[PDB]
Amino acid sequence: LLRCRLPGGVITTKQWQAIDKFAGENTIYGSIRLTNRQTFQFHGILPVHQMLHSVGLDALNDMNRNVLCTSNPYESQLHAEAYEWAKKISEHLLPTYLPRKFKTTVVIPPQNDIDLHANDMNFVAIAENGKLVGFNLLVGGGLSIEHGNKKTYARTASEFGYLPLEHTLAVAEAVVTTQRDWGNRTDRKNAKTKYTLERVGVETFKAEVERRAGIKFEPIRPYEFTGRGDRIGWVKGIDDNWHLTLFIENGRILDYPARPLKTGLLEIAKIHKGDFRITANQNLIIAGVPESEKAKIEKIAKESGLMNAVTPQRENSMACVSFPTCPLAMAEAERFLPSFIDNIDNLMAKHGVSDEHIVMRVTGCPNGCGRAMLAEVGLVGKAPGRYNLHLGGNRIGTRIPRMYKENITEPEILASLDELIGRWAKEREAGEGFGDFTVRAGIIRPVLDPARDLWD
Numbered sequence: 001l002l003r004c005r006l007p008g009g010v011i012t013t014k015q016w017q018a019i020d021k022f023a024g025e026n027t028i029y030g031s032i033r034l035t036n037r038q039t040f041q042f043h044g045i046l047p048v049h050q051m052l053h054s055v056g057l058d059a060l061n062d063m064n065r066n067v068l069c070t071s072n073p074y075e076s077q078l079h080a081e082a083y084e085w086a087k088k089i090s091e092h093l094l095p096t097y098l099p100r101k102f103k104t105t106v107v108i109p110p111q112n113d114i115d116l117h118a119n120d121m122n123f124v125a126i127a128e129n130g131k132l133v134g135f136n137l138l139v140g141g142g143l144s145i146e147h148g149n150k151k152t153y154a155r156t157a158s159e160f161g162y163l164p165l166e167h168t169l170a171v172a173e174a175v176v177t178t179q180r181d182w183g184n185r186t187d188r189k190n191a192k193t194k195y196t197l198e199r200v201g202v203e204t205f206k207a208e209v210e211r212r213a214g215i216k217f218e219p220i221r222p223y224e225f226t227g228r229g230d231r232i233g234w235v236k237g238i239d240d241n242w243h244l245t246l247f248i249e250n251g252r253i254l255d256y257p258a259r260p261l262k263t264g265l266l267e268i269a270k271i272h273k274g275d276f277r278i279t280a281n282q283n284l285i286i287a288g289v290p291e292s293e294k295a296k297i298e299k300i301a302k303e304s305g306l307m308n309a310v311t312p313q314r315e316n317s318m319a320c321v322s323f324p325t326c327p328l329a330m331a332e333a334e335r336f337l338p339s340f341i342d343n344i345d346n347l348m349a350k351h352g353v354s355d356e357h358i359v360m361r362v363t364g365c366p367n368g369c370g371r372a373m374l375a376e377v378g379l380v381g382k383a384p385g386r387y388n389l390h391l392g393g394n395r396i397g398t399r400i401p402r403m404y405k406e407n408i409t410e411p412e413i414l415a416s417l418d419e420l421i422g423r424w425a426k427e428r429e430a431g432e433g434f435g436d437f438t439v440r441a442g443i444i445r446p447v448l449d450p451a452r453d454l455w456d
């Protein structure tokens with residue numbers, strides 16, 4: 001169980017070659033697993049740190065987790081600055097004992113690929129003339145719950161206000177320390193920032209942060225999100241550069257018969273001029289490809305099976321690791337997803353909505369690593385082959401889905417979705433997402449204030 005610290009998911013080809021060798025020669029599984037926090041994991045290590053240190057990498061007493069940063073912004077020029085900040089915040093937070101783990105992100109609107117609402121502290125980038133001027137601060141998200149425990153809940157992050165770029169580190173430090181001091185001491189299931197906020201009140205927490213940071217928050221600056229998915233395929237970057245995002249099912253990199261994904265990426269790493277970017281959706285970006293090099297890269301990716309076409313549905317689906325390695329797993333997630341989506345693909349076709357997508361996620365237990373508590377349709381593992389079915393989130397990930405059915409099997413889940421997708425296909429307004437539709441049509445009540453109305 002080794003996971004590397006890699007702010008913003010940026011990894012060089014020199015580092016990639018080193019981790020590729022290790023994975024193949026020194027682990028039981030022989031795979032590289034991309035995580036939804038923009039980093040990677042080895043499974044079944046039979047020296048790991050010596051290998052990491054040799055290529056300038058380190059593995060994380062420390063309660064901090066990998067700092068995320070939007071991987072492929074529409075305004076491509078903004079990535080460099082945003083990434084510099086994610087790296088500075090990461091280094092700033094490097095070892096104070098936090099009550100529970102603390103998660104941070106740097107977001108570039110209109111993309112919410114990093115799923116800000118699942119994190120403790122989020123810096124939403126505000127730019128003026130292609131340059132960052134400051135950040136809107138949102139605090140308090142977290143998705144972990146305990147089955148049947150109405151004292152636990154998934155919570156979205158709350159807006160605090162805007163801060164100029166110069167106050168970033170002082171503000172980051174103030175949020176961390178306030179949480180460290182005010183976090184619950186008796187209980188660990190109630191130590192997370194989301195619980196502290198609900199206990200003391202957002203304004204109380206905000207006031208202490210301003211006091212500690214020595215600033216006063218300005219009113220929030222306008223921002224909107226349009227989606228959370230990756231931009232699969234080729235997109236034009238800045239200058240004569242291009243970015244190729246490869247869809248990797250479950251982020252599982254291994255050589256399969258007829259699809260040598262691992263060898264393919266190694267061959268690309270050997271000729272690639274730039275670096276790679278691991279996304280929050282468990283995919284990989286071959287970044288900074290000069291136009292002249294496009295054909296060489298695509299040839300390898302094509303031959304290796306890395307560019308095999310899948311439906312928009314599959315591109316917007318996700319699952320956590322779960323079995324066989326997770327010791328806390330209740331139901332299959334990663335190993336269940338491929339065939340489950342084969343079934344969903346058929347239902348979408350049956351109803352004439354094959355070009356559409358529903359943000360669908362499977363998490364193996366309520367800890368919520370697969371981020372099902374921010375999905376339009378979320379499945380939460382309860383027992384072998386059984387899940388709680390949640391409905392009602394939205395495409396952008398700003399609403400928690402309420403439990404619709406409890407402890408049901410795949411056939412029961414499919415039967416319910418066949419009916420609902422059928423209704424959505426016929427009764428939806430123009431451009432209306434599935435989650436919003438279930439709420440509008442009265443199929444499920446929305447969750448308007450999680451700490452108080454998540455549980456029926």
Ligand code: SRM
Pocket residue numbers: 003034035036037038039040041065066100103115118141142143144145192282319320321322325326327328367368369370371
């Ligand atoms: C690999 C990954 C899932 C994936 O398929 O991508 C994952 C895998 C594990 N997570 Fe996580 N978590 C992953 C993202 C998250 C997320 C989502 C996110 O951060 O974007 C969450 C939900 C958001 C949240 O924290 O509220 C999440 C909430 C947890 C929790 C519940 C924490 C809590 O506040 O209660 C645990 C259990 C714990 O810490 O006690 C945990 C525990 C674990 C462990 C380490 C199990 C353990 O403690 O022994 C899992 C290892 C499985 C394995 O064999 O590899 N993981 N986990 C993600 C690794 C990210 C990373 O590089 O750090």
Ligand code: SF4
Pocket residue numbers: 320321322323326327328329330333363364365366367368369370
């Ligand atoms: S949600 Fe549960 S089963 Fe899935 S990786 Fe996290 S801890 Fe393991």
Ligand SMILES: [K+]
Pocket residue numbers: 247248249250251281282283
């Ligand atoms: K993926």
